[PDB]
Amino acid sequence: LCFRMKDSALKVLYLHNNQLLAGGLHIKGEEISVVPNRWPEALEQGRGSPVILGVQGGSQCLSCGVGQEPTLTLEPVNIMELYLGAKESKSFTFYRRDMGLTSSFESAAYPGWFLCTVPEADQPVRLTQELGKSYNTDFYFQQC
């Protein structure tokens, strides 16, 4: 079972050039796998429910990388390997906070950094520490 996502400005999340973009208003959206980290106790759960985000049937997953500064990339690892503990998952883990209508996603590997979109159409989804400003950190789900 998968989800489709939009930012709170209703821009659809979809794939182009192996990047998640937000736009498609000029489109159902990429079917996103949202999978609970199966070892939750080892994480910071007051921040939200830890999940791994996948695309294309969970055959690629979103990572914040392992550098000093996070950056958002789709990596060719199946969510199964990340879920089964056959690959380290923390850079792939986000804390999902549910506000009712929308959810936000905070990097577990890089605290304070949130999944976000920019106002301009059809740009990459990225990460930000800045809340309440121009970057949109709130997302809608639609079930598939």
Side-chain angles (χ1 to χ4, degrees):
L1 171 150
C2 279
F3 302 88
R4 289 179 165 107
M5 288 177 55
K6 299 167 165 52
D7 62 19
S8 65
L10 304 179
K11 297 206 300 294
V12 169
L13 303 201
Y14 70 95
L15 291 181
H16 177 69
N17 294 346
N18 211 52
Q19 239 181 338
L20 211 45
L21 306 186
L25 290 199
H26 300 80
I27 303 303
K28 281 155 294 147
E30 180 69 16
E31 291 167 88
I32 311 291
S33 299
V34 184
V35 178
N37 198 286
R38 87 182 273 227
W39 290 285
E41 273 189 16
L43 296 168
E44 284 216 291
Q45 304 239 329
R47 287 184 191 259
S49 306
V51 296
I52 301 148
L53 299 177
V55 299
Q56 295 164 328
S59 59
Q60 298 201 90
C61 293
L62 278 175
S63 172
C64 296
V66 291
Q68 273 322 317
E69 176 92 329
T71 191
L72 195 66
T73 62
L74 281 178
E75 300 292 333
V77 49
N78 196 287
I79 201 140
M80 269 283 287
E81 288 191 25
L82 295 179
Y83 183 75
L84 268 61
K87 197 140 276 198
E88 173 50 23
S89 59
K90 192 162 187 197
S91 76
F92 295 92
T93 302
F94 295 81
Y95 300 113
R96 192 191 77 255
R97 192 190 176 208
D98 302 315
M99 282 75 159
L101 293 181
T102 57
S103 302
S104 59
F105 298 85
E106 180 184 355
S107 174
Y110 302 87
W113 290 85
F114 292 79
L115 201 68
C116 72
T117 64
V118 302
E120 177 183 18
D122 301 300
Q123 305 299 308
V125 171
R126 56 176 51 256
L127 298 157
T128 196
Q129 293 167 320
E130 306 179 56
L131 302 192
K133 288 226 147 214
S134 62
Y135 300 97
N136 196 329
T137 51
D138 303 308
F139 295 90
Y140 292 106
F141 286 115
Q142 290 171 301
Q143 185 179 300
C144 312

Short mmCIF file of all heavy atoms in Angstrom, two decimals, residues 2-6 32-34 51 53 96-98 100-105 139-144:
data_model
loop_
_atom_site.label_atom_id
_atom_site.label_comp_id
_atom_site.label_asym_id
_atom_site.label_seq_id
_atom_site.Cartn_x
_atom_site.Cartn_y
_atom_site.Cartn_z
N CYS A 2 0.50 2.24 -0.82
CA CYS A 2 1.30 3.44 -0.96
C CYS A 2 0.51 4.73 -0.78
O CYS A 2 -0.73 4.73 -0.80
CB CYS A 2 2.00 3.44 -2.32
SG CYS A 2 3.51 2.44 -2.37
N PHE A 3 1.23 5.83 -0.60
CA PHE A 3 0.63 7.15 -0.46
C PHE A 3 1.05 8.07 -1.59
O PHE A 3 2.16 7.96 -2.12
CB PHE A 3 1.01 7.77 0.86
CG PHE A 3 0.62 6.96 2.05
CD1 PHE A 3 1.46 5.98 2.55
CD2 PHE A 3 -0.60 7.17 2.67
CE1 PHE A 3 1.09 5.23 3.65
CE2 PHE A 3 -0.97 6.43 3.77
CZ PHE A 3 -0.13 5.45 4.26
N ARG A 4 0.19 9.01 -1.94
CA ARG A 4 0.62 10.14 -2.75
C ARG A 4 0.67 11.38 -1.86
O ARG A 4 -0.09 11.49 -0.89
CB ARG A 4 -0.29 10.32 -3.96
CG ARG A 4 -0.06 9.20 -4.98
CD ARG A 4 -0.96 9.31 -6.18
NE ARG A 4 -0.50 8.46 -7.28
CZ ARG A 4 -1.10 7.33 -7.65
NH1 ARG A 4 -2.18 6.91 -7.02
NH2 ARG A 4 -0.60 6.63 -8.67
N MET A 5 1.59 12.28 -2.16
CA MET A 5 1.83 13.45 -1.30
C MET A 5 1.74 14.75 -2.08
O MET A 5 2.05 14.79 -3.28
CB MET A 5 3.21 13.37 -0.63
CG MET A 5 3.32 12.33 0.46
SD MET A 5 4.98 12.20 1.16
CE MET A 5 5.33 13.88 1.66
N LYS A 6 1.31 15.80 -1.39
CA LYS A 6 1.29 17.18 -1.87
C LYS A 6 1.81 18.08 -0.75
O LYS A 6 1.63 17.73 0.41
CB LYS A 6 -0.13 17.63 -2.25
CG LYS A 6 -0.78 16.83 -3.36
CD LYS A 6 -2.27 17.15 -3.45
CE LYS A 6 -2.88 16.68 -4.76
NZ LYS A 6 -2.57 15.24 -5.00
N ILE A 32 4.36 6.88 -3.01
CA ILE A 32 5.36 6.89 -1.96
C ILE A 32 5.13 5.76 -0.97
O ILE A 32 4.01 5.58 -0.48
CB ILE A 32 5.35 8.24 -1.19
CG1 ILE A 32 5.36 9.42 -2.15
CG2 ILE A 32 6.48 8.29 -0.16
CD1 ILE A 32 6.64 9.59 -2.88
N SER A 33 6.18 5.00 -0.67
CA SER A 33 6.12 4.04 0.42
C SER A 33 6.49 4.75 1.72
O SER A 33 7.48 5.48 1.77
CB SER A 33 7.06 2.87 0.15
OG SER A 33 6.68 2.20 -1.04
N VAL A 34 5.67 4.59 2.75
CA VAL A 34 5.97 5.17 4.06
C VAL A 34 6.01 4.03 5.06
O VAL A 34 4.97 3.48 5.45
CB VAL A 34 4.94 6.23 4.49
CG1 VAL A 34 5.35 6.87 5.80
CG2 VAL A 34 4.77 7.28 3.40
N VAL A 51 10.04 6.91 10.16
CA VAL A 51 9.64 6.22 8.94
C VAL A 51 10.74 6.35 7.91
O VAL A 51 11.59 7.24 7.99
CB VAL A 51 8.33 6.78 8.34
CG1 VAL A 51 7.14 6.56 9.30
CG2 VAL A 51 8.46 8.26 7.99
N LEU A 53 11.14 6.67 3.70
CA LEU A 53 10.34 7.09 2.55
C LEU A 53 10.89 6.47 1.26
O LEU A 53 12.06 6.67 0.92
CB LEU A 53 10.31 8.61 2.44
CG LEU A 53 9.69 9.34 3.65
CD1 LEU A 53 9.79 10.85 3.47
CD2 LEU A 53 8.25 8.90 3.79
N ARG A 96 8.02 11.48 11.57
CA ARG A 96 6.78 12.02 11.03
C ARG A 96 5.90 12.55 12.13
O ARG A 96 5.45 11.79 12.99
CB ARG A 96 6.00 10.96 10.25
CG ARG A 96 4.86 11.58 9.43
CD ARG A 96 3.91 10.52 8.86
NE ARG A 96 3.00 10.00 9.88
CZ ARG A 96 3.12 8.81 10.45
NH1 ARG A 96 4.12 8.01 10.11
NH2 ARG A 96 2.25 8.41 11.38
N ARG A 97 5.65 13.86 12.12
CA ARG A 97 4.73 14.44 13.09
C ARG A 97 3.39 14.68 12.42
O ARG A 97 3.32 15.32 11.38
CB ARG A 97 5.30 15.74 13.66
CG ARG A 97 4.55 16.24 14.87
CD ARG A 97 4.97 17.64 15.27
NE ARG A 97 4.17 18.13 16.39
CZ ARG A 97 3.92 19.41 16.62
NH1 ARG A 97 4.41 20.34 15.82
NH2 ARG A 97 3.18 19.76 17.67
N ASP A 98 2.31 14.17 13.02
CA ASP A 98 0.98 14.32 12.45
C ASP A 98 0.25 15.45 13.14
O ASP A 98 0.10 15.45 14.36
CB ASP A 98 0.18 13.04 12.59
CG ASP A 98 0.85 11.87 11.93
OD1 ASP A 98 1.33 12.04 10.78
OD2 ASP A 98 0.92 10.81 12.57
N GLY A 100 -2.84 16.30 12.09
CA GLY A 100 -4.21 16.18 11.66
C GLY A 100 -4.34 16.22 10.15
O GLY A 100 -4.35 15.17 9.51
N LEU A 101 -4.44 17.41 9.58
CA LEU A 101 -4.58 17.51 8.13
C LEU A 101 -3.26 17.15 7.46
O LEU A 101 -3.24 16.49 6.42
CB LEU A 101 -4.99 18.92 7.71
CG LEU A 101 -6.39 19.37 8.12
CD1 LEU A 101 -6.62 20.78 7.58
CD2 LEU A 101 -7.43 18.40 7.59
N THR A 102 -2.17 17.59 8.07
CA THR A 102 -0.85 17.45 7.42
C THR A 102 0.18 16.77 8.31
O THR A 102 0.00 16.67 9.53
CB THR A 102 -0.27 18.82 7.01
OG1 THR A 102 -0.17 19.66 8.17
CG2 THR A 102 -1.14 19.49 5.96
N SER A 103 1.28 16.34 7.70
CA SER A 103 2.40 15.80 8.45
C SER A 103 3.69 16.50 8.05
O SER A 103 3.83 16.95 6.92
CB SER A 103 2.55 14.30 8.22
OG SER A 103 1.36 13.62 8.59
N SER A 104 4.64 16.57 8.98
CA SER A 104 5.99 17.03 8.66
C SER A 104 6.99 15.89 8.86
O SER A 104 6.70 14.91 9.55
CB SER A 104 6.37 18.23 9.54
OG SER A 104 6.31 17.88 10.93
N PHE A 105 8.16 16.02 8.26
CA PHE A 105 9.15 14.96 8.29
C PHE A 105 10.50 15.55 8.70
O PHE A 105 11.05 16.36 7.97
CB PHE A 105 9.26 14.27 6.93
CG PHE A 105 7.98 13.59 6.50
CD1 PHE A 105 6.98 14.31 5.85
CD2 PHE A 105 7.76 12.25 6.77
CE1 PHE A 105 5.80 13.69 5.47
CE2 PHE A 105 6.59 11.62 6.40
CZ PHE A 105 5.60 12.35 5.75
N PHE A 139 2.85 18.49 4.73
CA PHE A 139 2.45 17.66 3.59
C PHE A 139 1.12 16.95 3.82
O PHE A 139 0.83 16.49 4.92
CB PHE A 139 3.52 16.61 3.30
CG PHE A 139 4.82 17.20 2.85
CD1 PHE A 139 5.79 17.55 3.77
CD2 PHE A 139 5.05 17.44 1.51
CE1 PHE A 139 6.99 18.13 3.35
CE2 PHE A 139 6.22 18.01 1.09
CZ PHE A 139 7.20 18.36 2.01
N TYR A 140 0.33 16.85 2.75
CA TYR A 140 -0.88 16.02 2.72
C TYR A 140 -0.56 14.64 2.19
O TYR A 140 0.28 14.49 1.30
CB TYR A 140 -1.95 16.63 1.81
CG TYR A 140 -2.54 17.90 2.32
CD1 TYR A 140 -2.22 19.12 1.74
CD2 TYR A 140 -3.46 17.89 3.38
CE1 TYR A 140 -2.77 20.30 2.21
CE2 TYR A 140 -4.00 19.06 3.84
CZ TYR A 140 -3.66 20.27 3.25
OH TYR A 140 -4.19 21.45 3.70
N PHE A 141 -1.24 13.63 2.73
CA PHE A 141 -1.24 12.28 2.17
C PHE A 141 -2.55 12.00 1.43
O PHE A 141 -3.63 12.44 1.83
CB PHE A 141 -1.09 11.22 3.25
CG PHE A 141 0.29 11.11 3.81
CD1 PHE A 141 0.53 11.42 5.14
CD2 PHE A 141 1.34 10.66 3.04
CE1 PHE A 141 1.79 11.30 5.67
CE2 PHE A 141 2.60 10.54 3.57
CZ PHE A 141 2.82 10.86 4.89
N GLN A 142 -2.45 11.24 0.35
CA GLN A 142 -3.62 10.62 -0.25
C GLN A 142 -3.30 9.14 -0.43
O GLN A 142 -2.20 8.79 -0.84
CB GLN A 142 -3.98 11.28 -1.57
CG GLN A 142 -4.54 12.69 -1.40
CD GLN A 142 -4.68 13.42 -2.72
OE1 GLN A 142 -3.70 13.62 -3.43
NE2 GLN A 142 -5.91 13.84 -3.05
N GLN A 143 -4.24 8.26 -0.09
CA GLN A 143 -3.93 6.84 -0.12
C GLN A 143 -4.08 6.29 -1.54
O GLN A 143 -4.87 6.80 -2.33
CB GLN A 143 -4.82 6.07 0.85
CG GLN A 143 -4.47 4.58 0.97
CD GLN A 143 -5.35 3.84 1.96
OE1 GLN A 143 -5.38 4.18 3.15
NE2 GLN A 143 -6.07 2.84 1.48
N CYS A 144 -3.27 5.29 -1.84
CA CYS A 144 -3.36 4.56 -3.10
C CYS A 144 -3.96 3.18 -2.87
O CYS A 144 -3.87 2.30 -3.72
CB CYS A 144 -1.98 4.44 -3.75
SG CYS A 144 -1.07 5.99 -3.82
#
